[PDB]
Structure 1
């Protein structure tokens, strides 16, 4: 079952500049940074709060590592802004299988590696009224 908003994925041209804007304007600190070569992103997680299911909610700031990537293509077309939303679950494999059985396109057979060792999948935005939708089980 999906038990939280895990994160808001925000695409930006310059991660270091955008991280500084969040820190200076709101006082949000960097929880974690990493590069995901498979996804083609340099990412910064800013933790905003903890959640009633035992997890947390983050802003996930993303800069593309290459133009030919999900976020590189999206930035080229749309400019900086919200790229995806992510829901947390204790069992991404089971929740993904249930949602596949409703005819929503699940982009990965098997969950892949996301932030901080998480296991992730995505739902096609054209099946979700225009919202690229991530499912996340934390490590």
Structure 2
């Protein structure tokens, strides 16, 4: 089941400047940062709240590490802004198989590594009314 909004993925040209914007404007602090070379992003997660399924909701700020990447291409075309939304689940593999069986394109055969050891997949935006949609199971098991 999809039990929370896990994060909002926000593309930006300069991670450090956008991180500082969110800190200065709203007081949001960095929960974690990393590079994901497979996905081609430098990310910062800003935790906004905890959630009733035991998880949390974040802003995921993303700067591309290369132009030939999902975020690099998207920024070139659209400029800075919201790139994707992510829903949390305790079983991404099962929920992705169920959604595949509805005819929505699931981009990975098997979930891949995302933020903080999470396992993630994506649904094609043209099958989701224009919203690039991620499904994520956190690495650490959640207590509702």
Under a length normalisation based on structure 2, what TM-score does the superposition of the two structures give?
A: 0.95
Point out where structure 1 has 5 or more consecutive residues left out of the alignment: none
Displacement of 1:124 in angstroms is 0.1
Q: Deviations over 1:103-135 (max 9, x none)?
A: 000000000000000000000000000000000
Q: Distance in 2 between matches of 1:114 and 1:125?
A: 19
Aligned to 1:110: 110
Aligned to 1:63: 63
Q: Distance in 1 between matches of 2:96 and 2:20?
A: 35
Displacement of 1:56 in angstroms is 0.1
Cα RMSD of the aligned pairs, angstroms, is 1.6
Q: Distance in 2 between matches of 1:98 and 1:87?
A: 15
Displacement of 1:26 in angstroms is 0.1
Q: Deviations over 1:67-102 (max 9, x none)?
A: 000000000000000000000000000000000000
Displacement of 1:20 in angstroms is 0.1
Q: Deviations over 1:29-80 (max 9, x none)?
A: 0000000000000000000000000000000000000000000000000000
Q: Distance in 2 between matches of 1:69 and 1:19?
A: 21
Displacement of 1:6 in angstroms is 0.1
Point out where structure 2 has 5 or more consecutive residues left out of the alignment: 138-142
Q: Distance in 2 between matches of 1:119 and 1:20?
A: 28
Displacement of 1:12 in angstroms is 0.1
Q: Distance in 2 between matches of 1:109 and 1:4?
A: 23
**3-state secondary structure, aligned to 1:77:** helix
Q: Distance in 1 between matches of 2:122 and 2:84?
A: 9
Q: Distance in 2 between matches of 1:52 and 1:124?
A: 27
